[PDB]
Amino acid sequence: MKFNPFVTSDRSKNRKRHFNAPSHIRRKIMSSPLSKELRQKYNVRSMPIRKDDEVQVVRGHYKGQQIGKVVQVYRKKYVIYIERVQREKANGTTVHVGIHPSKVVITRLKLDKDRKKILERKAKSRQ
Template structure:
């Protein structure tokens, strides 16, 4: 890959869907990292996350992911909203790199298989 910023942006915005999923990853909290034995995971709906960077109004707030928008490459978190001019509240889009996963949705068997596979890869 090139080190030119323009080509990096081109790659980012023209990436295929399977690459976008990887780009939408977030670090795990220290506790979860120790428990699972991996550093990061793609964010999914139902995960509990904590905002660690960004606007001071939202920093250190926790909530469940209510929507993952792959087209805009943003996630929407329960409880993090802003008011529009007409008074209606809308969820604030946040980039996945600005959050850390505090708790994962363990109901998804496919995801647990992915975690096991990655854990086995790290051990060898």
């Protein structure tokens, strides 16, 4: 139950902050869980997704065994786009299907020194 009186339970205020949050808040909003072997190996629950993360989709029209690399992250639309996931238009032009990153299981992260510092802070705070 909410006990701190300086945070809202208001539906209008929560939806307002959610649909008008800036991009550095929207990065925290668009976070994705990890696979079970990768969370066993890194001791972390979830990570924010970036341009070069490999993605297995668990739910939707495309489900399972489709590990592909993402290409675009529209934080305005709360939508990542995956290279493997395709859909043809009327005129034979392919286009990427909108997938929300909360229904996204990351199988391979991107190695960077900044992400190593983030992962170390996650592991130290998870303890």
